[PDB]
């Protein structure tokens, strides 16, 4: 299917940015949230919607629930200005199906 | 095992134990004083066998996890509780005078997961964390597998919602002591189904998949 | 249900333990209550269900024993502890009491 | 916490002597008064218990005859009367309270006793 | 000391055909899923297709079904991605990334991504 990730999230530094994953019954079907900077290629930053990785700062959160998904990065700095993208494997379909995305700036 | 009735108000109970509880429903003696009970501290000091009544201290009869609970705020009754729990390696039995509680020995098996930091060594059955792959580890559970879950940060809805569909039933969830025991049905129509829940250790989720 | 207390004749120094056996004609678990009869005065109740020790009595004083033999366990004597004990079957409806044991010093 | 108990007094012998056992300090209701015998050279022995809340009485099997026991809640006083002196009868009487009625514990325990009313037959 | 090196910037005419080539150093082939996500010139990610490491995969996306054919040799460890019939919407900046092969593959995520090729058309 496809997911309604809003175009643009404004978000001022030292605060929380809610980006929403919408889709149709997106609780019974795993996130994996990708940053993208302009150039740099996405890095991964949450999979299976509330894991944090290895290697990332602590600030970088998110859950899943019901219809929609928030990636909750707290606490807004400088050099998370990029565009998160949320990723969807359909089962049903055997094919994943990638979010649009949602840059935020600070 | 085929019955519903754990209320003592001569009661006598047959059940797989895993953290349920007995009440024991007793007077307060200021109306009806002709009504006693043989044991003193019963679920504490309590007869293991039926004939020869000896006092056994309940730290010595079989039990492995246990707590017991003796509270009186209510006025019209007062009640001594001891929680019993699946870890017990044998069908031990106790008379309170006649009260006959008997706990079976769980016939199935024990999967035990420590993500909390704690010594759980009552039942050394386990996966550890270690066995948690990319942070996500996924324990199959045989027909009545009973899997344990010791992390403290549960958050909401454990085992409620399973992912992909069809959502893996469980007979009975327990949520006791910060420790969350998951009941395999038994029973299922098709293997694959999945059961989920969340956990936070060192502020990263594990999370824990079941499925038949 | 006479409950005799064997050991009632006694005569004990000062700084001496001593142990008080109590024994009943039935068993009676642990409802029994330990009581210090002063000459004279009144009886003090000393232990509570001989488990546990009532407020008021110094730690020199102890219960021990269940079901049918029961112990008392003074870790100093004192002229204080100088009096008649007791035994209470608090077991059955009549309450059969001790003949009483004077712990002379 | 104390429990005053009325000054003794000998009756003559085929006499009746009434013993006032006076509560003070915790609600007179509630707890159960049990009377003792404290026969000269012989141990304590149990006559009965008086419920102060229902009222009710009962007494042992030697005196399920002769004893009787009243009160006033007026007053909150505990009133023994026993009938059929005999030179058994003789005796220091205490009138007792159950700190363990109130709550928990089903054993009988005597926290609080009376001075001790002398009788003498 | 672990990375993923994709082939060099590359430009190809319209029409004509473009191999991508994703050699996995660091890490073992054929432990994680391969995927192609292609990111189009000031354009959100688009997941071009899948290849299973146990089996051969036939997983591709319904717009990139036709000139999408996605082979593993194994025998270099090297992910191939070859690509034909180019337009103006087949030109983009291409990423491998991998995910841990399991029974069920909704959890994971794609935690290594490529250096990135640049194709022009
Ligand atoms: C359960 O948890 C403990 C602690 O998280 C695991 O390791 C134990 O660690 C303590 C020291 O903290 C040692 O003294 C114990 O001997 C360890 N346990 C064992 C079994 O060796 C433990 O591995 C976990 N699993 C089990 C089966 O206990
Ligand atoms: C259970 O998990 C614990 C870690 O929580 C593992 O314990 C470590 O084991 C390695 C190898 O034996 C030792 O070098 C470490 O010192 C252990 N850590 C601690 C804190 O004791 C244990 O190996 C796991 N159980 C397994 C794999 O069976
Ligand atoms: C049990 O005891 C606790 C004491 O904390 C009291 O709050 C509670 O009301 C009691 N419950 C029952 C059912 O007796």
Same mark, same amino acid.
């Given at each position: ?106 | ?212 | ?105 | ?55 009710? @009485?009962? =007494?042992?099997?030697?005196? $399920? %005859? ?41 054993? @009988?325990? =005597?926290?609080?006793?009376? $001075? %001790? ?5």
């Amino acid at each position: 299917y496809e997911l309604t990730q809003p175009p643009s999230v404004s978000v001022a530094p030292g605060k929380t940015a809610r980006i929403t994953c919408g889709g149709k019954d997106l609780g019974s079907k795993s996130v994996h949230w990708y940053q993208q900077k302009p150039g740099q290629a996405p890095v991964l930053v949450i999979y299976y919607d509330n894991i944090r990785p290895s290697g990332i700062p602590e600030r970088f959160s998110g859950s899943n629930s019901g219809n929609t998904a928030t990636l909750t990065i707290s606490r807004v700095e400088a050099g998370d200005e990029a565009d998160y993208y949320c990723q969807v494997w359909d089962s049903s379909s055997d094919h994943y199906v990638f979010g649009r995305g949602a840059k935020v700036t600070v | 095992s085929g019955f519903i009735g754990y209320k003592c108000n001569f009661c006598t109970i047959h059940s797989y134990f895993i953290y349920d509880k007995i009440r024991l429903i007793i007077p307060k003696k200021s109306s009806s004083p002709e009504f006693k009970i043989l044991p003193e501290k019963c679920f504490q000091k309590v007869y293991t066998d039926y004939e020869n009544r000896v006092e056994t201290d309940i730290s010595e009869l079989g039990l492995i996890e246990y707590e017991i609970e003796e509270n009186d705020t209510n006025p019209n009754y007062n009640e001594r509780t001891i929680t019993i729990s699946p870890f017990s390696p044998k069908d031990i039995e106790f008379f309170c005078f006649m009260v006959h509680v008997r706990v079976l020995k769980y016939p199935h098996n024990i999967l035990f997961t420590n993500l909390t930091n704690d010594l759980f060594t009552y039942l050394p059955k386990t996966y550890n964390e270690s066995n948690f792959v990319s942070n996500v580890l996924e324990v199959e559970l045989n027909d009545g597998e009973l899997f344990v879950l010791a992390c403290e940060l549960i958050n909401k809805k454990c085992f409620q919602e399973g992912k992909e569909k069809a959502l893996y039933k469980s007979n009975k969830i327990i949520y006791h002591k910060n420790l969350t025991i998951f009941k395999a049905p038994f029973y299922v129509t098709s293997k694959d189904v999945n059961t989920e829940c969340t956990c936070k250790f060192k502020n990263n989720n594990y999370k824990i998949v079941l499925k038949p | 249900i006479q409950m005799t207390q064997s050991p009632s004749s006694l005569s004990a120094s000062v700084g001496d333990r001593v142990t008080i056996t109590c024994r009943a004609s039935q068993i009676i678990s642990t409802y029994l209550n330990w009581y210090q009869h002063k000459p004279g005065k009144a009886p003090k109740l000393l232990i509570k269900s001989a488990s546990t020790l009532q407020s008021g009595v110094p730690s020199r004083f102890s219960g021990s024993g269940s079901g049918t033999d029961f112990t008392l366990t003074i870790t100093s004597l004192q002229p204080e502890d100088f009096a008649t004990f007791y035994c209470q079957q608090s077991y059955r409806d009549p309450i059969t009491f001790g003949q009483g044991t004077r712990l002379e010093i | 916490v104390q429990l005053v108990q009325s000054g003794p007094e000998a009756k003559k012998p085929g006499a009746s002597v009434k013993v006032s056992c006076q509560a003070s300090g915790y609600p007179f209701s509630g707890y159960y008064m049990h009377w003792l015998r404290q026969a000269p050279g012989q141990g304590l022995e149990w006559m009965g218990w008086m419920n102060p809340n229902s009222g009710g @009485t009962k =007494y042992a099997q030697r005196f $399920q %005859g002769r004893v009787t026991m009243t009160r006033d809640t007026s007053i909150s006083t505990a009133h023994m009367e026993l009938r059929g002196l005999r030179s058994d009868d003789t005796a220091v009487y205490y009138c007792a309270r159950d700190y363990c009625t109130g709550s928990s514990c089903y054993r @009988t325990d =005597y926290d609080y006793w009376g $001075q %001790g009313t002398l009788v003498t037959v």
